[PDB]
């Protein structure tokens, strides 16, 4: 019969309803992540005997900047834009900058996972 306080916070996410300070037992709220972040786990949590169920996670996207590419002497293969947004699990293809050749490197076709992307590298 115990009532719950405000639902828990999650990084890069928020509840979809007007926030309250007292929730009745059995009440539920739903979460939403920021643009390009992925919702992992049940997006709904429920109040039960003063405790909220575990809230979902906001899996990070990848911002592919021109700076890191210039550091590794790389560029986007297909499109010619200098900044890319990639959801987690998305696949990004690279090529060497003009006048550069691949070193010993991870694949130039690389997957973004939870804000982590292993970049390839070129030299010469």
């Amino acid at each position: 019969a115990e009532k719950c306080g405000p639902p828990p916070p999650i990084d890069n996410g928020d509840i979809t309803s007007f926030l309250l300070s007292v929730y009745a037992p059995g009440s539920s709220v739903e979460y939403q992540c920021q643009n390009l972040y992925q919702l992992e786990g049940n997006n709904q949590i429920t109040c039960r005997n003063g405790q909220w169920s575990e809230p979902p996670k906001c899996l990070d996207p990848c911002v592919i900047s021109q700076e890191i590419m210039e550091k590794y002497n790389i560029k986007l293969k297909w499109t010619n834009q200098q900044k890319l947004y990639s959801r987690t699990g998305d696949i990004v293809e690279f090529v060497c900058k003009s006048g550069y050749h691949p070193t010993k490197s991870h694949s130039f076709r690389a997957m973004c996972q939870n804000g982590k992307l292993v970049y390839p590298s070129c030299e010469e």
């Binding site: 007007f18 920021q34 947004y85």
Partner: protein, 296 residues
């Protein structure tokens, strides 16, 4: 002191009507005129009985605008249209200023803020427009799409910071979003070339205490003759940019740089109103009211 006489602003009390964009066009001058006349305490000589009337008009606008608040708490010209980032941010801006004049529902304001945060902010802090407004003349210097990321991010961030007092306790993701937008603006400020973007992003950064060092020097040395921020183009854009920059200087408390800027603004003798006058009318008089409020 150097207050603009209320008579010259008579035409700014406007009955709002139309759809989601036109209604805001009608609401803007009345809200900002009541704001400026309250700050300058001109209602006694101008007519106290009129003020209540204006308030009704404002309320009218507010009520009508709620007919275009989509279930997502976002706004567009019509409920069948995709919601506009700019229009939602501008509704937040106007309503945050109007909270002192009429009753503004925090549910609506903070829902719009939360929609902006959760839907239209990019992973690097940029705010993006996916359905531009039809009335391209109501967005002022934003109509020039050059440096659109910085300019729109500054606009939306100013809206977020003006609603921070009402929505802080309701929107847990608001300070982090403000910080991300400020990080983007601060990282790309020095590469700016438009005086308009310099001014608006400088106001956004000064609200955060981030306009400092070389960024502050670039903001100050971008002004022409140390009294205006101008670019080749429509003069209304220059008026609006100089208003943003005057608000930035007021936030910086650089009262030694202000007098010539306010002098130039008063010499412009711009009394707002008319087609394509939304941003200029709102901003020049918000800035002048803030000047009358502060300033030694």
């Amino acid at each position: 002191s150097r207050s603009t006489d209320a008579e010259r602003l008579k035409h700014l009390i406007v009955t709002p009507s139309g759809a989601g964009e036109q209604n805001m066009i009608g609401m803007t001058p009345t809200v900002i005129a009541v704001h400026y006349l309250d700050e300058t305490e001109q209602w006694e000589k101008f007519g106290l009985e009129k003020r209540q009337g204006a308030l009704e008009l404002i309320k009218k606008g507010y009520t009508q605008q709620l007919a275009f608040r989509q279930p997502s708490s976002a706004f567009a010209a019509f409920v069948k249209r995709a919601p506009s980032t700019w229009l939602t941010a501008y509704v937040v801006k106007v309503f945050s200023l109007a909270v002192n004049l009429i009753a503004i529902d925090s549910q609506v304001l903070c829902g719009a803020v939360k929609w902006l945060i959760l839907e239209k902010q990019k992973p690097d802090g940029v705010f993006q427009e996916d359905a531009p407004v039809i009335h391209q003349e109501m967005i002022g210097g934003l109509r020039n799409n050059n440096e659109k990321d910085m300019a729109l991010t500054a606009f939306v961030l100013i809206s977020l910071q003006e609603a921070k007092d009402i929505c802080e306790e309701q929107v847990n993701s608001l300070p982090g979003s403000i910080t991300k937008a400020g990080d983007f603006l601060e990282a790309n400020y020095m590469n700016l070339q438009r005086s308009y973007t310099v001014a608006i992003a400088g106001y956004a950064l000064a609200q955060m205490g981030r306009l400092k060092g070389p960024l502050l020097n670039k903001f100050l040395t971008t002004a022409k003759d140390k009294n205006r921020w101008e670019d080749p183009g429509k003069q209304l854009y220059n008026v609006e940019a100089t208003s943003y920059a005057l608000l930035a200087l007021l936030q910086l408390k650089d009262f030694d740089f202000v007098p010539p800027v306010v002098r130039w603004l008063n010499e412009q003798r711009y009394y707002g109103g008319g087609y394509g006058s939304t941003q200029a009318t709102f901003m020049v008089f918000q800035a002048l009211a803030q000047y009358q409020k502060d300033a030694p």
